[PDB]
Amino acid sequence: MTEYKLVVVGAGGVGKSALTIQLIQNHFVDEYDPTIEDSYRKQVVIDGETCLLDILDTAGQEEYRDQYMRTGEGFLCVFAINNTKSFEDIHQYREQIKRVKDSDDVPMVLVGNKCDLAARTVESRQAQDLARSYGIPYIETSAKTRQGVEDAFYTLVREIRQH
Ligand SMILES: Nc1nc2c(ncn2[C@@H]2O[C@H](COP(=O)(O)OP(=O)(O)NP(=O)(O)O)[C@@H](O)[C@H]2O)c(=O)[nH]1
Ligand SMILES: [Ca+2]
Ligand SMILES: [Ca+2]
Ligand SMILES: [Mg+2]
Numbered sequence: 001m002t003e004y005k006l007v008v009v010g011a012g013g014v015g016k017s018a019l020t021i022q023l024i025q026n027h028f029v030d031e032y033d034p035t036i037e038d039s040y041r042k043q044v045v046i047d048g049e050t051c052l053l054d055i056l057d058t059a060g061q062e063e064y065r066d067q068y069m070r071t072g073e074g075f076l077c078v079f080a081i082n083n084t085k086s087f088e089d090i091h092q093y094r095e096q097i098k099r100v101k102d103s104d105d106v107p108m109v110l111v112g113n114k115c116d117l118a119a120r121t122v123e124s125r126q127a128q129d130l131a132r133s134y135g136i137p138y139i140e141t142s143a144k145t146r147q148g149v150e151d152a153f154y155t156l157v158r159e160i161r162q163h
Contacts, residue, residue: 002051004157007069009093010078011086012060015113018143019078020057023153028144036064046157053153069100074107074160076152080114081140084121087112090130107159108136111152116142 008016017038018029024040038057043050056072058065069075075097079086090110097106110131112122124140131138137155141148 002049003054004051004160005054005056005071005073006076006153006156007056007058007072007074008076008078009058009065009069009097010060010076010111011080011083011089012062012064014060014078014080014083014086015141015143016060016076016078017057019076019111019113019141019149019152020055022143022146022149024055028146034061034064035059037068046154051157053157055153066096066100069097072097072101073163074109074156076109076111076156078111078113079122079127080117081112081122081127082114082117082119087122087127087130094134105163107156107163108134109152109156109159110134110136110138112138112140113143115140115147116144 017035021029024042040055042053077090077093079090112127127138139148139152141152
């Protein structure tokens with residue numbers, strides 16, 4: 001039917017895998033096993049359309065990408081709200097996306113994850129400002145509670161549809 005190729009990128013430990021696994025498998029991964037490159041598939045109905053999501057869960061750790069990202073149609077750019085450095089490095093991921101796609105207009109959503117945690121160093125307004133400069137939505141999530149998880153991924157699908 002209708003297939004959407006989604007790619008999740010961002011710094012090591014920000015919760016890329018936990019987000020993807022919550023969406024697809026409906027549980028929270030508490031442990032931290034660094035990812036190399038994993039993929040997930042699932043059929044879902046989004047706004048009345050039956051569709052297939054193909055989700056690529058990428059590595060954040062420099063040790064553990066460009067080739068995999070090439071076929072991506074939309075990207076979640078993830079940072080954690082308790083990790084200022086992960087936010088500051090979002091530009092690096094966007095730059096990589098623009099290179100692999102050879103376009104300055106690629107569907108993306110900015111995601112501030114771990115919103116259940118109280119040691120916040122990135123305020124919502126700061127992230128909204130970054131997103132606005134890129135012309136994309138900002139959404140906060142918790143892979144732990146499931147807050148915003150479906151919204152983040154489904155919003156990305158709706159961004160691809162505007163492309
Ligand atoms: N409290 C809380 N912990 C979270 C959340 N998301 C992820 N974590 C925790 O953060 C750690 C790293 O999560 P993980 O999903 O493995 O991160 P990653 O971005 O995929 N890492 P990598 O880039 O190395 O593959 C895990 O211990 C996980 O339980 C969240 O929303 N809230
Ligand atoms: Ca668990
Ligand atoms: Ca290129
Ligand atoms: Mg991972």
